[PDB]
Amino acid sequence: KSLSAAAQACVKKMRDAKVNEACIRTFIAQHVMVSKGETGSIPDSAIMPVDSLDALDSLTIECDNAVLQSTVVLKLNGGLGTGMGLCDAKTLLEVKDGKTFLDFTALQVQYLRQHCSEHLRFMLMDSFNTSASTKSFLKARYPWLYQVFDSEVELMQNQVPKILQDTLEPAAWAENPAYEWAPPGHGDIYTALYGSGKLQELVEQGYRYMFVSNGDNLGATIDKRVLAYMEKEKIDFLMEVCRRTESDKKGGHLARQTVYVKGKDGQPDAEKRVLDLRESAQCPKADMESFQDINKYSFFNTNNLWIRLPVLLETMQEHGGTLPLPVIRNEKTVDSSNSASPKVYQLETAMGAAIAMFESASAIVVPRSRFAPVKTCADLLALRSDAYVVTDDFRLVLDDRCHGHPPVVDLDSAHYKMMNGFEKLVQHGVPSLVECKRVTVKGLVQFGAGNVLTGTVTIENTDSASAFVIPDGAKLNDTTASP
């Protein structure tokens, strides 16, 4: 079929590698779009703010046991935390008390089975980058998961060809041909579910809902109220959003994309509010100050998502066996560390974007207990610290003393972006942050043993040659400390 010579080269390459067809049909529609100049840009001009949503904390109704039992849980596990200097799955980092993201995830599942739903179904979406390590970490530590890993747990995401910028042909990189390929973002979950046959298998088995969340978000868990809300309101797709803080910078905001709908009368013309997501990579830099404005776009996507599985299966079947999420065209070199390697486009989607694919879509505001993201080492420090606690059901959430506000941790990006620098900052121990509204570390620093930070603290070293090492036991309150 289609159509340009570049596109055909992509189809051939993909088929030769036995990539499944649903992934092929999806990639190619994106390629067609990109070849017409689509970048995935969503300018401010194209959207508006959303201002009223229901709040989860206002809801009280719980779903029945059959509804809960129809619910599958899936965790995202396919990216690497490269910004924090990681070359393997982020879920493998230790978060609290000598346990990793993966450990807590498994414990949350174990707890649900014991207490809540005996046969609860759990899935991990792995990529080629993360699959072997996840599988090995599991074999050792959660054998009940490892049995059934290949068979039931893992959803393997697609690989799609990186395409050359100049031609839109598939990239050649003879030094490492695997670098000619990448997982096409978390938006790929739908394609992978469908293409694998797993989606149909789940519907056949009688599962009706899927709850999906980021691997780095240990807050996120099944909530019976959400399920009940969905049933009562007949929602096919639901996005959990948090009221946006200062700290929410790596992510997406909820938006409204403007339409008036025809009720078998042309007279009027009330218009449905069609919700959408704008990712950071979708915002033209010119409009970036707007994107950053936490008043204007005050609802931030958690990536806690609810999907009514039959509706999804059907939507896809009828859209040619695909879900037509807006492509995001990233620019990279084929090898990330070689700046001179061929320039590419990497085509990706975001799973949140599916809010636009359903007539019955919405969003609900949720508390921070459901959202403890780790995108940065500063996030990691807070989570590691006493600000965060482990619940009976193995979630990590803020200590009650915090009152739902995470401590604002601002760490000098020069020194604490990479995992190594961060480990250095805390070589002598993680400070108490539970009482700290904001901590700012500027320049090169180390915490001492047993430090306690309260109120608003700035630790500043402008010397930059020697580490300001905080003395053991120091209590810092509403102060600037300096050498």
Ligand SMILES: O=c1ccn([C@@H]2O[C@H](COP(=O)(O)OP(=O)(O)O[C@H]3O[C@H](CO)[C@@H](O)[C@H](O)[C@H]3O)[C@@H](O)[C@H]2O)c(=O)[nH]1
């Ligand atoms: O190809 C991919 C890319 C990512 N991931 C995983 O998806 C999760 C989220 O990815 P990450 O890079 O951490 O977050 P973003 O894609 O920037 O942002 C997501 O998470 C934010 C909340 O933390 C939301 O605001 C954004 O809208 C949502 O897209 C993590 O578990 C990743 O490992 C995959 O499985 N496959």
